[PDB]
Amino acid sequence: GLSQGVEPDIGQTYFEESRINQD
């Protein structure tokens, strides 16, 4: 989530940006 670039963030806020994928 949040905003960072890409790889995934399925969690945190979104699906795709915060490439470490937090809760």
Curated annotation (Swiss-Prot):
Mutagenesis / variant outcome for changing F15W: Gain in thermostability
Role summary: Shows weak antimicrobial activity against its phylogenetic relative Caulobacter crescentus. Does not show activity against other bacteria tested (E.coli, Vibrio sp, Burkhoderia thailandensis, and Salmonella newport).
Gene: AtxA1
Name listed for the protein in its UniProt record: Astexin-1
Cystine pairings recorded for this chain: none
Effect of R19W: No change in thermostability
Comment field on protein domains: Is composed of a ring composed by 9 residues, a loop and a C-terminal tail. The peptide is threaded when the C-terminal tail is inserted throught the isopeptide-bonded ring.
UniProt PTM: This lasso peptide is probably hydrolyzed to a linear form by the isopeptidase AtxE1, in vivo.
Organism in which the protein naturally occurs: Asticcacaulis excentricus (strain ATCC 15261 / DSM 4724 / KCTC 12464 / NCIMB 9791 / VKM B-1370 / CB 48)
Cross-link (Isoaspartyl glycine isopeptide (Gly-Asp)): G1-D9
Site note Important for stabilization of the lasso structure, residues: Y14, F15
